[PDB]
Amino acid sequence: ASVPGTTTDGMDPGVVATTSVVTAENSSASIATAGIGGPPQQVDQQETWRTNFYYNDVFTWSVADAPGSILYTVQHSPQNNPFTAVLSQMYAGWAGGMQFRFIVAGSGVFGGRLVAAVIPPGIEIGPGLEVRQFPHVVIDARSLEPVTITMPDLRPNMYHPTGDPGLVPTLVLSVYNNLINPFGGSTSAIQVTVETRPSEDFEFVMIRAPSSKTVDSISPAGLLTTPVLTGVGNDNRWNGQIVGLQPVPGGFSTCNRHWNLNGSTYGWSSPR
Amino acid sequence: YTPQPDRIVTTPGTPAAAPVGKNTPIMFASVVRRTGDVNATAGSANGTQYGTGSQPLPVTIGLSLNNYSSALMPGQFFVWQLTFASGFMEIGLSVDGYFYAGTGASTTLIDLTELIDVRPVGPRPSKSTLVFNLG
Amino acid sequence: ASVPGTTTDGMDPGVVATTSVVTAENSSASIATAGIGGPPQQVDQQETWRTNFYYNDVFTWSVADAPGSILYTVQHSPQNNPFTAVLSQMYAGWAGGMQFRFIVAGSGVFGGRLVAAVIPPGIEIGPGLEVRQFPHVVIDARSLEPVTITMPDLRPNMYHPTGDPGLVPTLVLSVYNNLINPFGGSTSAIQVTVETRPSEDFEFVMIRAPSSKTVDSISPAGLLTTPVLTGVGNDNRWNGQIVGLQPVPGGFSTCNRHWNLNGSTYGWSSPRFADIDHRRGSASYPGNNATNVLQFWYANAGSAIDNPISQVAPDGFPDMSFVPFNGPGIPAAGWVGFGAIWNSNSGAPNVTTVQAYELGFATGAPGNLQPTTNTSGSQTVAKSIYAVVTGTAQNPAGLFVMASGVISTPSANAITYTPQPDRIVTTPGTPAAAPVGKNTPIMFASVVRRTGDVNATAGSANGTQYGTGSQPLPVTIGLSLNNYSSALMPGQFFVWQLTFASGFMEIGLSVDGYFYAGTGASTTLIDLTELIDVRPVGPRPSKSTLVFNLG
Amino acid sequence: MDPGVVATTSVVTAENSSASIATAGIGGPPQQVDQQETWRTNFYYNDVFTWSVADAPGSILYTVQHSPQNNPFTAVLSQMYAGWAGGMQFRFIVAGSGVFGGRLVAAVIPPGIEIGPGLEVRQFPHVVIDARSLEPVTITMPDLRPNMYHPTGDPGLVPTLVLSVYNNLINPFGGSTSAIQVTVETRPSEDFEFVMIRAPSSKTVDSISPAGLLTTPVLTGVGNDNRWNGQIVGLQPVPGGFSTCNRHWNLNGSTYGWSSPRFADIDHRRGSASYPGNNATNVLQFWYANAGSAIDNPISQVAPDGFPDMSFVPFNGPGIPAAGWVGFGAIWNSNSGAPNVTTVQAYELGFATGAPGNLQPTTNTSGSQTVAKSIYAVVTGTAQNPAGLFVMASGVISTPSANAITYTPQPDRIVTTPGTPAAAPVGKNTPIMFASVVRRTGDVNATAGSANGTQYGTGSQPLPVTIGLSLNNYSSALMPGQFFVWQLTFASGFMEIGLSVDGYFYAGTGASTTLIDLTELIDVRPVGPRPSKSTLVFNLGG
Amino acid sequence: MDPGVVATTSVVTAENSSASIATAGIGGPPQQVDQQETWRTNFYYNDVFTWSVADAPGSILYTVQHSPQNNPFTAVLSQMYAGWAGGMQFRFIVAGSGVFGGRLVAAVIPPGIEIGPGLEVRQFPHVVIDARSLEPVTITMPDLRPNMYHPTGDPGLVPTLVLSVYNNLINPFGGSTSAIQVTVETRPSEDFEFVMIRAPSSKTVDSISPAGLLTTPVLTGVGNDNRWNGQIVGLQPVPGGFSTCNRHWNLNGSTYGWSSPR
Amino acid sequence: FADIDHRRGSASYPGNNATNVLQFWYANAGSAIDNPISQVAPDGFPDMSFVPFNGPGIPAAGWVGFGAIWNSNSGAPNVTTVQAYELGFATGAPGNLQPTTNTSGSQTVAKSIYAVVTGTAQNPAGLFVMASGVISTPSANAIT
């Protein structure tokens, strides 16, 4: 009695594609050296946030992208999942893997393949990075079942602290083979959606008070929120409603009332 | 817009916002009234006047209280997703504090009146094209 | 034995996809809870109204819909199934889940996925809602077998009263991935049909009289039928038959006889074409001779003490900005009317001055008369367009103007529809119609006589003048009494289906009282001559584009 | 004991229940058969009929056929089922009194029998219902059919239930109370079932029997007349009768007259114009045409659309005429008409004979001529032979001084076309006429307060009723000889209002000419058809 | 038979009694549930309403909500209990006469329905009450609620009991007597229970509906006017009307005039 | 904290000479059709009662902001009538100036506190005043 591949459950991983970085000794070492933070917390395997896949990002794959061109890049972090980012406000450290589910919304008439490799930490990410010379999994554009890969937690640290996570692996989806629409025309692009889920060895180690360093001090996610860019936030020059974005093709250099990510300024004005 | 990059007073020592690939620096526009026309607001028949700033005021307020040194290594963007009524587009934040969106050599002002959802996606490399399509 | 999958029975679900909320002990905690209404009514899992899937709503899925764009969202209600909606007027409360079966009309050459999530009842649904971060399933556009998604009854209440259900879960089926049609050409959309069958735990509890009134604002499907368009039914500014709809690109704002979903008006002028009467206001005339002059009446905006709705204008005074004119040349458009002057203190109207007067709102009377845009800080004005041999100059004076109006045109050939969107006055604090997506606001035209030509007939001898109004008067009459605050969820519109002789056009009605159509950037008047019948569809969100299949 | 408890109860079956269920399997399984449902174990209201003392023993009061519209919940279930079979239980509740006496017959007539005066119900298998009975009498209607099931929309031959007088109603008092009300309550029997589910879009009964068209606000809110667009504040009876045919629509899809139901405009193109006096300064313009020259009106040729159907009053000189119909308007020349600037005035229109000499009022439209004379002075007067009028549709009443003349029109001034049905008082019932407060020329500020009684203008029937009747055909929706009756409930009383096959409205006031105010009126309610011999109730607040 | 004997009796339950008691355990054990108590096995006076001949058939005479203030002993028990659940039994006693006639409708309106002129009670599951009836007609009000229990002070959605005219009252005499009195008697049902005991200092109804302010001695003893401080000996009617605004206080906390009450 | 902007507010100057005159601007409340929330007053208007003051006398505990008057036919502000204008509510503008609290029947009344050469007497004129305000004090000593 069957389920049509066309439709997938949220708990359904699809086809589990393995990679040479994903091993048993890596997982056993991950748990054995994550135990220094204490017992594993939020480890109950029947929770809704641990079994279901939740949306991370979507991206466009077109026929104008050469092979080796990187389309999608995710750093290993608990901010990828929307539920481990909420559980990280009350825990002082995290350790373990994460699973990424890819759904390629192509038909049988398309051609070309994606590639998927887990970059070890310490490697620069950008153009000239040859994904296809890593341990990799190819993904066809005519794939119907979703394909999933596990990101192993390849760390030099024992655990990752919440404020400073340290060095983390990176997952890249680049063009393995050029997408080819045999037809010819303006309708030459497809979309691939990434859903993320914590693995079986993902855990948080020690608890901490949420009145500690808050979400405005560990990541700048709350600096740009929804009402700020619509009718609340003002510029740092004129005190007016931000109603547009003006691109500068030649570049500029603003010194006064401009703060970097190091909490410093080169100007002469307080932030008001 | 008045704050043209050819006339901005800058102390010696600040980093420069340079275009990285197809990504280009952006500056946050706002309607600023003039001494040529008091009643000139957005959509005026006399012509709207735009005042542009480098960062939003809540962003530079929150940047002056906290430190994100262990959040973005040099050469990485922090990217938010801005979805509109028609399309969606992405802006990114550098280490120096400048905002980067990928439009290439285009200088058209973004309308920004149909913005509905602003959400973050996390750290991304600097030499990657942020997706921009208003339709 | 063997079905191929191309043919599915009405009792056939196909593939069943439960996301994370269809649990057995949830159904057990819902069945034992709903006994507070007594024995469960209409529970028998052999009846043909609850074992077969039935049509609820069909909707299109174009290639222009971005991921996350809302295609089809319904709340948990008996109205999602036709026989359950029939028994909903028979019963007085319900509890239990419902099965939603989706059929995708797509070939194997299409591509793209459709997400489907069950929203918990406490979540406000609007622009900032992200659907794909909920427990969901995806449905491909190449789905041959139908997919059923059972929406359970998650509720903080015991049972759901039909009058006040409180908090109900919501099924949202939005775009997961862009539908691709790798072929170019005219084919850029497919269709998805939603079938609905009540679940194994659906039940009704109490009886009530057939269709007894209820706290739940009734669905506004009865205030707009077919005759309204091709028969009786008049306008808001004038009393004429609606001969067509015209789309205005940019928007407009009318706040005279306009009532919102929540029964309220922002302005004067109760919905009835009676007459215009005032008592306080001054009359004056130019010229040293009191013979063959033009009378000049004005009062300030706020002396309408007898008006029980708002003080800013007398009842029936039109919302037309004044066109300033001087001399024997008659003005271009405006609101004239056959009327007279009258004095106060038990005074009857004067015999020798009955004439056509044009009315309006001015600023700076009686000097440099200027047109007025805002109602606040203004003054109402009225002056004759023809010659009358007498003038009165008493400080207490008033008008008597018939309520039906016409448009004064100097040469009167083709002209322009009146009033324009730049000529309608507005009270402060008005809501403004804006074009959302490809949907533009529309405005209903009618045939109105002119002072230059008495024969303003729709035939030969010059094109006609189309007088335009905001919403029809039977809609305002039926909506000035009832309250529809909970009938339609804000951010969507109640869409109907007009059926012409060679096509169809969908018309939506928002929460502001305005009407929307997906004509696009066109100013072409659409003629209602071949319109046959009107069938209601129901709630549909603003991201969906209405069809414009015209012959 | 019929409470809201768990309850044992007893759902009484029918005599042919074993063969009703078995042969109704041709539609498949029986649907909505479950004996614990609370729509099947309770009696619900079906109809009320009036049993008066003036009825013969054996005269039929209440007749109804076997149908699922006899129950409020089987009729609700009937839109989603294309076929039904099974019996029904009827309960009769009498209002009655201890001092009243007389019996009734309830019996089930088998199919193939005519129902009328010749039918003798007392020899059928029946039950007897007293007037003074406390416990309501229950009868069961078996489903005696020549078919296997009754499809909705064409049910075939059905049994009939007939209520006849066994002994005539006696009141030992005398007058005052001379009628009683009996309530029929209807419950499905044991063998009642539905078969063969259908889409609810399919509908059979589309004639409410003129019902949903007259709701309550129509009278305590919106609602206008047929003469002016005035708000309805009163009903006033007239004894003797009246005739109206302008915007008066009968129960079929027809009318006898002009003037489509809309207050837009009056426009006529061809007709002669004149003015008296040798001086063409400060005169009264007089326009005339004959009856039958209206080519542009597609309904009737006798008048332009919107012309008032009143008789012209003969007046001359500077005196303002009493009563009448005036409206603001102007005269326009032909040949791509642009009107003359120097003539816009109030004009009194109407019907005369012998224009422009000795003007006499007219009663019949045949042999008459339409006239239009100004009441106020105008500085120019034309006399061109092709000329027309353009008069607004809403009108006011011209008056010499203030005070209050009478309600206008009187029943004798109203013009009729040949072939018009006349209102006649039948029994103690008498026709009514809907009143509205209208503005006048002697006093513009005719607010309903002090400074004499305000002027009342009366039309025939409400406009909502004219609009909702024009489209639909009701040739069988009301059985001739009866009227459809609504039940108005005030704050301190109630009244029954009827509606015949001719569009007229009736109330049982008798010989009284007093206006009845809908100030304290709250709600109306449909009842159904009821015969003309029954007097409508007049338990008002007085 | 309702005497002061040992008695067998019959305390008639409700249709949803199995689910009313079980879900009311969220407040703990059920309190004041004992079927031999004499405040639960007898009918007591609740309200009287006048049914006149000048009322339309279907006009609402008596409307009341499901509440423990409908019984004189559950309202007494209500000050020491912060929550109740369960049904109630209503009995209607008509004064009537043999010469009077006409029926009434008693039915339980489910929650979520407006109560007024548009409501049609005759198509509800109901009981019929004659004017000339000897034995009083009993209806049971089930506790149909969207909550588990009704806390006192904010009971939520409750069913409503509506008395409407089935057939209008007729008097074949003429004038004189043109109204009748109907007495409503109220008894708790089988599943009625209290939960979650509270201090009696807590109070909900503090407006007597202007009641305890006018007692009897106010008129046959102490009591003064608003103009002079004179003892009240009479009431005198006036036809046509009058206006007083000096020490005349309306039902809100306001007046239109001077002269504080002293 | 945005600027105060109002169209068609009456402006005048007392006397006949236009040397060291004090600029007077007033507009009735309920006529400022500029906000989507209410028409009682323009945006950024302080909720302060006007303390009356004449001649060369600095007012006290008052909301003074830097402002100018523009012609409504063009929108261009006038050159010389840029001063620190007291912003508040008053009851009677052409006669004696008195403070007020209620908005019904009061009027938005603005007046400069230092001497301005000449001044616009145009009746449909408009008033612009910047967002933030400083304190009008007769002396250098602080108050409550």
By the 8 A CB rule, do C481 and C263 touch? yes
What tokens were used for A45?
């395997």
Cβ-based neighbours of C81, under 8 Å, separated by 6 or more: C54, C56, C98, C196, C197, C198
Half-sphere exposure (CA, 13 Å, Cβ side) for F73? 4
Of residues C127, C436, C437, nearest to B117 (C-beta): C127
Helix (H, G, I), strand (E, B) or coil at D343: strand
User: How do F62-70 and F126-129 pair as beta strands?
Assistant: antiparallel
Separation of alpha carbons D427 and D533, rounded Å: 6
Question: Is the four-CA dihedral C70, C72, C77, C79 of positive or negative sign?
Answer: positive
Contact F61, F51 (CB under 8 A): yes
CB of D455 within 8 A of CB of D397?
Answer: yes
Distance from CA of A41 to the nearest CA of C (A): 23
- Side by side, the strands of the sheet bearing D160-165 are D60-65, D160-165, D103-109, D126-130
Question: How many Cα atoms are found within 13 Å in the side-chain-facing hemisphere of D66?
Answer: 29
CA distances from E164 to A109, D38, D538, E209 (A): 72, 21, 20, 24
Residue with tokens 């007769």: F138
Non-local CB neighbours of E31 within 8 Å, separated by 6+ positions: E81, E193, E194, E195, E197
For C78, the token pair is 């008996």
Task: State the smallest CA–CA distance between residue C532 and chain A in angstroms.
Answer: 39
Token output for B88? 């969606």
Residues 6+ apart with CB under 8 A from D445: C277, C279
8 A C-beta contact, residue C46 and residue E30: no
Alpha-carbon distance A161 to A210, whole Å?
14
Tokens of C169: 């879960």
- CA distances C178 to A63, A104, E149, Å, are 16, 11, 49
Contacting partners of chain C (3+ CB pairs under 8 A):
A, B, D, E, F
DSSP string, F46-59: ---BPPP--SS---
Contacts of C376 in chain F (CB under 8 A): 30-33, 39
Tell me how far apart the alpha carbons of residues D355 and E36 are, in angstroms, rounded to a whole number: 97
Question: CA-CA distances (angstroms) from residue D198 to D24, D82, F28, F123?
Answer: 17, 6, 67, 74
CB F131 within 8 A of CB A239: yes
Question: For residue D94, what are the contacts with CB-CB under 8 A and spacing of at least 6?
Answer: D129, D130, D131, D132, D133, D136, D180, D181, D182, D183
Kindly state the tokens that stand for D327: 């409206």
Given the DSSP bridges, would you call strands B117-125 and D339-353 parallel, antiparallel or unpaired? unpaired
Rounded Cα–Cα distance for residues D397 and D326 (Å): 6
A189 closest CA partner among A106, A246, A266: A106
Q: Dihedral, CA atoms, F99, F102, F107, F108, nearest 10 degrees? A: 80
**DSSP assigned state of D70:** G
CA distance from start to end of chain E? 56
Token pair belonging to C438: 């490809």
Single out the residue of E112, E191, E125 nearest to residue E158, CA to CA: E112
Question: Counting every residue, how long is chain C?
Answer: 551
Would you state the structure tokens that stand for residue B127, as one six-digit string? 């030499």
Q: Which residue has the tokens 């005719």?
A: D446
**Cα distance between residue D287 and residue D285, in whole Å:** 7
Beta partners for residue D235, in sequence order: D434, D516
Comparing CA positions, the residue from D277, D273, D303 lying closest to residue D288 is D273
* C-alpha span between D374 and C386 (Å, rounded): 18
Whether the CB-CB separation of E105 and E121 falls below 8 Å is answered with yes
Peptide bond between residue D308 and the one before it cis (omega within 30 degrees of 0): no
Q: What is the DSSP string of C314-367?
A: -TT---BB-----SSSPPSS-EEEEEEEEESSS-PEEEEEEEEEEEEEEESTTS
**How far, in Å, CA of B2 to CA of C516, rounded?**
40
* Pairwise CB contact (< 8 Å): F76 & B40: no
Measured in angstroms, the CA of C223 and the nearest CA of chain F are apart by 31
Number of neighbouring beta carbons within 10 Å of residue C55: 12
SS3 call for B58: helix
- Interchain proximity C139–A7, CB inside 8 Å: yes
Q: What angle do CA C117, C120, C124 make, to 5 degrees?
A: 100
Q: Which of C314, C299, C323 is nearest to C422 (CA)?
A: C323
Residue D356 preceded by cis peptide, ω within 30 = yes
Site of tokens 């191309």: C6
**Which residues touch B3 (CB under 8 Å, ≥6 apart)?**
A237, A252, A254, B27, B51, B52, B53
Q: Please, are residues C81 and C150 in contact by the beta-carbon 8 Å criterion? A: no
**Residues of chain F found within 8 Å of residue C369, distances taken between Cβ atoms:** none
Chain D nearest CA to C370, separation (Å)? 26
- In chain D, what is the straight-line distance between the N-terminal and C-terminal CA atoms, in Å? 39
**Three-class SS of residue C79?**
helix
- Interatomic CA distance for residues D498 and D504, integer angstroms: 8
**How far apart (Å, rounded) are the C-alpha atoms in residues C360 and B121?**
57
Touch between D and A (at least 3 CB pairs under 8 Å): no
Residue E20 has phi, psi (to 5 degrees) of -75, -45
Q: Which residues in B lie closer than 8 A to residue A251 (C-beta atoms)?
A: 5, 16-19, 24-25
Rounded to the nearest angstrom, the gap between the alpha carbon of residue C550 and the centroid of all alpha carbons in its chain is 21
Distance CA C416, CA B24 (A): 48
- Can you read off the two tokens belonging to residue D418? 């040949």
E214, E123 Cβ separation under 8 angstroms: no
Rg, C-alpha atoms of chain C: 29
Task: Please give the backbone phi and psi of residue C350, each rounded to the nearest 5 degrees, phi first.
Answer: -80, 140
Tell me which residue of D230, D251, D399, D231 sits closest to D320, measured CA to CA: D399
User: Residue C39, preceding bond cis, omega within 30 degrees?
Assistant: no
**What radius of gyration do chain F's Cα atoms show?**
14
CA E130/CA A212 separation, integer angstroms: 75
Distance, CA of D165 to CA of D101 (rounded, Å): 11
> C251: Cβ–Cβ under 8 A, 6 or more apart, which residues?
C421, C432, C433, C434, C435, C441
CA angle A85, A89, A91 (to 5 degrees): 105
Contact call for residues F44 and F1 (beta carbons, < 8 A): yes
Quick one: tokens of D189? 């029997």
**Is C94 in a helix, a strand, or coil?**
strand
Task: Please report, to the nearest 10 degrees, the dihedral formed by the alpha carbons of residues D378, D379, D383, D385 taken in order.
Answer: -60
Record the resolution, in angstroms: 3.3
- 3-class SS at B57? helix
Query: CB B85 to CB C128 under 8 A?
Result: no
DSSP assignments along chain A, one per residue = ----TTEE-TT---EE---TT--HHHHHHHHHHHGGG-S-BS--TT-HHHHS-EEEEEEEEETTPPTT-EEEEEE--TTSSTTHHHHTTSBSEEE--EEEEEEE---TT-B-EEEEEEEPTT---STT--GGGSSEEEEETT--S-EEEEE----SSSSEESS---S--EEEEEESS--B-SS-SS--EEEEEEEEEE-TT-EE--B--TTSS-HHHH-TTSSS-TTIIIII-BBTTT--BEEEEEE-SS-B---TT-B-TTS-BSSS----
How many whole angstroms separate alpha carbon D329 and alpha carbon D334? 16
Alpha-carbon gap, residue D61 to D55, rounded angstroms:
9
How far apart are the two ends of chain C, measured CA to CA in Å?
A: 47
Q: How far apart are CA A197 and CA C9, in angstroms?
A: 37
Backbone angles phi, psi at C449, to 5 degrees: -65, 160
Q: How far is A189 from chain C (nearest CA, A)?
A: 8
b/e string for C38-48 if b means 16 or more Cβ within 10 A? bebbbbeeebb
Maximum pairwise Cα distance, chain D: 98
Question: Residue C258 is which amino acid?
Answer: H
Q: Which of F7, F33, F74, F120 to mutate to test the interface with B (most CBs of B within 10 A)?
A: F74
The Cα angle at residue D505 between residues D501 and D507, in degrees rounded to 5: 125
Cβ contact A–B (≥3 pairs, < 8 Å): yes
Residue whose entry in the numeric block shows the structure tokens 């002789």: C501
Q: What b/e readout covers D463-486, taking b as 16+ CB neighbours within 10 angstroms?
A: bbbbbbbbeeebeebbeeebbbbb
F65, β-bridge pairs: F85
Direct distance between the N- and C-terminal alpha carbons of chain B, in angstroms, rounded to an integer: 25
The structure tokens listed for C211 are 């269709």
Per DSSP bridges, beta strands A147-151 and A15-16 are parallel
Cis peptide before D409 (omega within 30 of 0): yes
Chain A residue numbers with beta carbons less than 8 Å from the beta carbon of F131 are: 239
Residue C188 · residue C43 · CB < 8 Å: no
Helix (H, G, I), strand (E, B) or coil at D60: strand
Residues 6+ apart with CB under 8 A from A270: none
Give the residue among C126, C164, C163, C134 at the shortest CA–CA distance from C151: C134
State how far the Cα of D266 lies from the Cα of B127, in Å rounded to an integer: 77
DSSP, collapsed to helix, strand or coil, labels residue D210 as: coil
Q: List Cα–Cα distances, A102 to A58, C1, E253, in angstroms.
A: 9, 36, 69
CA distance F126 to C138: 59
A interface with F, Cβ–Cβ below 8 Å: 239-240
Nearest CA in chain E to C210: E123
Q: How many Å apart are CA C225 and CA D149, to the nearest integer?
A: 34
Residues making up chain F, counted from first to last: 144
Helices in E95-198 by DSSP H: which ranges? Answer: none
E strands in D455-525: 456-459, 482-489, 494-499, 505-507, 516-517
Chain C residue whose CA is closest to A144: C140
Q: What whole-number distance in Å separates Cα of residue C471 and Cα of residue A102?
A: 49
Chain D contact probe: residue of C89, C90, C338 with most D CBs at under 10 A: C338
Taking CA atoms, what residue in F is nearest to A232? F1
Please check whether residue D256 is in contact with residue D460, taking contact to mean a CB–CB distance below 8 angstroms: no
Distance CA C399, CA C23 (A): 72
- Count Cβ atoms within 10 A of the Cβ of residue C456 and give its class: 0-12 exposed, 13-18 middle, 19 or more buried: buried
